[PDB]
Design a protein around this ligand. Sequence first.
Ligand SMILES: OC[C@H]1O[C@H](O[C@H]2[C@H](O)[C@@H](O)[C@@H](O)O[C@@H]2CO)[C@H](O)[C@@H](O)[C@@H]1O
Ligand SMILES: [Zn+2]
Ligand SMILES: [Zn+2]
Length: 413
Amino acid sequence: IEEGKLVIWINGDKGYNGLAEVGKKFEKDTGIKVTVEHPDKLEEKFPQVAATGDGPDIIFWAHDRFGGYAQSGLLAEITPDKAFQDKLYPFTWDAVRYNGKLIAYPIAVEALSLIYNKDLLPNPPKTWEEIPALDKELKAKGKSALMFNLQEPYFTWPLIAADGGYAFKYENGKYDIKDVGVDNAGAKAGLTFLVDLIKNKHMNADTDYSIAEAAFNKGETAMTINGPWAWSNIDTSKVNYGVTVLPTFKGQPSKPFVGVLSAGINAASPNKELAKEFLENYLLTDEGLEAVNKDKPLGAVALKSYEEELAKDPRIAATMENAQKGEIMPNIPQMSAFWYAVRTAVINAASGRQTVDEALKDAQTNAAAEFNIFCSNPNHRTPTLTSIYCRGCSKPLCASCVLLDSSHSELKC
Ligand SMILES: OC[C@H]1O[C@H](O[C@H]2[C@H](O)[C@@H](O)[C@@H](O)O[C@@H]2CO)[C@H](O)[C@@H](O)[C@@H]1O
Ligand SMILES: [Zn+2]
Ligand SMILES: [Zn+2]
C-alpha cells in the first residue's frame, strides 16, 4: 500500500464517478491523490489481499460482510468524536457496530422496492398472488409483468421471508445462529411461489440484473424489483416510473434485508488519518454525498443534514416503507456462508435442477455446517461456548448470560 495517497474500492453499481469527484476535491485541498477503483468480486478479494497487508485504504460495501472482515482483523477501528457521531443517524451506527467497536463509517440505507411503469400499470399490485393473473393480461399485449434478478438471492429473499423464512432466529434483540430458518414452511412457501411463476411462464428462469434492467428500462416489462442505485439508469431512460412497497404474500408484507452501505479502513493502511479526514470531512458532508448521489442514487444517507433534503423524494419514502417492513441485515461472520447457501438453492430451484424442498434442505444444512464461538463476558475464566449474538453490538453471549444478566436489551445496550 502506497504511503501518501488513498486507494478506494467500491462496487460497480454505485456512483464511483461521484466518489472520484470527492477524491479530486480532497486532492485540490490536501494535494493527496485519491484513486477510486471498482473491482469485480471485491467483497471476496478484499479479505484475500488484506490478509497480507495489501488492498485499498478504504473499502465500500453493505455492512453485512464487515463483521467477517473485523473477525479476521482486516479493519481499523474508527474513532469519531461524539460531535461527529451526532451528525449521523443512530440507526446507521448500530449497523457498523461489531464486537462493540465501530468498524466502518455508515453511508446510506438501502432497501429493495417494487418499481413499476405508470403507463402500463396505473395501479401496481398489492399482492404477489395477483401477478400471475396480471402477467396473463399483459401477455395479451405482448408485455410482461415482472422481471428481476434471480441470480442474486438478495432480490428474492423479501418473498422468501414474507411468510416466515429467516436467516437466524431473532428474539429480544438477539440472534441465535443454531436456529436457521431456510427450509421452514414460510420459506418453502415463498420459494415455491416464485418458481411457479417460471413454470407458468410468468418469469424466465435465467433473468439476471442486466437483463431485467434492460427490459424494464426498454419498456418491455411493467415491474421490476431493485434498490436506489438502479434509479440512475431508469431516470436517464424515457420510462415513466414510480417506486412503491413490495407486494404482500399470503397477507404478510415482503421483508427485504436492509443494507447500510459502509466505508471500512484497512487495518494495514499507512494512511488511516487521511482516510478518516477524507470520510469525515469530505464524503460525509452535504456537498460530498450530493456528488455521489447525483451519479447513482445512495438511498437514505446516514448524514442527518443531507437526508433532511432527500426525505421529500417519494422514492426515498418508498424505500423507507420497505426498509421498515424488512429487517436490518446481521453482520456476523456467518452471514456470507448463508448468502452462498441461499444463492445456490434459488438458482437451482428456479432452473429446475432441484425441487424447492430439495434445494432448501441442501442450503439449510450447508449453511449450519460452517456456523466455534465463545461468550464475550471476560469474567468467564474459561471460553464459554454459545451461538447467540446481540444484535446491537454484534457480540456473542452465552445462554446463561442471555437469561440472567440484563446487560444487553433490545431497547438499549
Ligand atoms: O445476493 C446476496 C448479496 O446481498 C447483498 O448484496 C447487495 C448489496 O447489498 C447492494 O448494495 C447491491 O449492490 O446489490 C447486492 C446484490 O448483488 C449483500 O450486501 C451481499 O453481501 C450478498 O452477497
Ligand atoms: Zn456468558
Ligand atoms: Zn448488545
